[PDB]
Design a protein around this ligand. Structure first.
Ligand SMILES: [Cl-]
Ligand SMILES: [Cl-]
Ligand SMILES: [Cl-]
Ligand SMILES: [Cl-]
Ligand SMILES: [Mn+2]
Length: 340
């Protein structure tokens, strides 16, 4: 039967089923006040699916100049064309190659650039903003979004949305690599998975994806969405409570020293955005510091609500198009205050 919600992460993560149900706030606000992330499924079914395809972005914007990032080594590929990225998104035989002759795992950097999403893509902007879940929180002028209402003593988010466009990580070696390394945001955000690209050429990559989710610490109920409903899994997330950020900095300072980095005792390894917590580091965080996180698999049309100040990292399983909007909930306004 249709139900309003379910639980993942063994009861620790709310999953809302109907993105446009007018009663979602009643369930949402109890979990959000405790500092938890929230998942809302089904947003894809509300969107104009032809607007969110890799071939459309290539056809409409392909001549723009851009930089890419190599996800395996963080190297910058400078001053190429937006089509170089998009035409390799699903066809592996069209990707830019590293020195070693392998097809690269790439991310499209700062595109559309800065606050230009609305100007460059007005039909996409309208399609996203009118279908975001929890609209009193997430719309630019929602009654519970303080973004437009705060003085200069509070850090205000830039005008969004922002896109996250990157290929899937492929190999056993790639299992320890981040798409986006561990960091935090001083505003709340909602990140929507609008397209998942399962490639061809090296098409039959199904079993490394299962071992990644398993070793990623995904819960048994999450393993059922793949095997039973055949939904398309996009990306593996780890999210940590805002209250645990300093313990994570203590672990990463100690590992930095062990690996002979030479760092002032006060340096900020989360702000540096240089670390990905692999299975070894996640086990050490739990055993040595008493810190548990949320392992989340984001499928096509899942919206991930990320609390202000919560450290988070993202590992793409397949090629993903994600779009995110920042907001400032009253529950979390402390995280953007500039004093004490
Ligand atoms: Cl909080
Ligand atoms: Cl558009
Ligand atoms: Cl709402
Ligand atoms: Cl990163
Ligand atoms: Mn982030």
């Amino acid at each position: 039967s249709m139900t309003s919600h379910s639980w993942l992460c063994d009861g620790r993560l709310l999953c809302l089923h109907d993105p446009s149900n007018k009663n979602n706030w009643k369930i949402f606000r109890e979990c959000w006040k405790q500092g938890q992330p929230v998942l809302v499924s089904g947003v894809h079914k509300k969107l104009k699916s032809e607007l969110w395809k890799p071939e459309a972005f290539s056809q409409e914007f392909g001549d723009q100049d851009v930089d890419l990032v190599n996800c395996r080594n963080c190297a910058i590929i400078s001053d190429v064309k937006v089509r170089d990225f998009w035409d390799g998104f699903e066809i592996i035989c069209k990707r830019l190659r590293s020195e070693d002759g392998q097809p690269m795992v790439l991310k499209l950097k700062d595109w559309p650039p800065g606050e230009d999403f609305r100007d460059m893509m007005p039909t996409r902007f309208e399609d996203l903003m009118e279908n975001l879940p929890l609209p009193e929180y997430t719309k630019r002028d929602g009654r519970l979004n303080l973004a437009s209402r705060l003085p200069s003593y509070f850090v205000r988010p830039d005008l969004g949305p922002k896109m996250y466009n990157a290929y899937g990580l492929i190999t056993a070696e790639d299992r320890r690599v981040g798409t986006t390394n561990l960091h935090l945001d001083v505003s709340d955000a909602v990140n929507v998975m609008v397209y998942v690209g399962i490639p061809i050429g090296e098409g039959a990559h199904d079993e490394e994806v299962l071992k990644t989710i398993d070793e990623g610490d995904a819960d048994e109920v999450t393993k059922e969405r793949i095997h039973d409903h055949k939904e398309k899994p996009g990306a593996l997330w780890h999210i940590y409570a805002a209250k645990d950020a300093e313990k994570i900095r203590e672990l990463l300072r100690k590992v930095g020293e062990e690996q002979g980095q030479e760092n002032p005792p006060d340096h900020d390894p989360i702000h540096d955005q240089s670390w990905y917590l692999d299975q070894t580091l996640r086990k050490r965080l739990y055993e040595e510091y008493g810190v548990q996180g949320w392992a989340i698999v984001q499928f096509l049309g899942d919206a991930v609500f990320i609390p202000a100040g919560a450290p988070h990292q993202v590992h793409n399983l397949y090629s993903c198009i994600k779009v995110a909007e920042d907001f400032v909930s009253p529950e979390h306004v402390k995280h953007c205050f500039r004093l004490t």
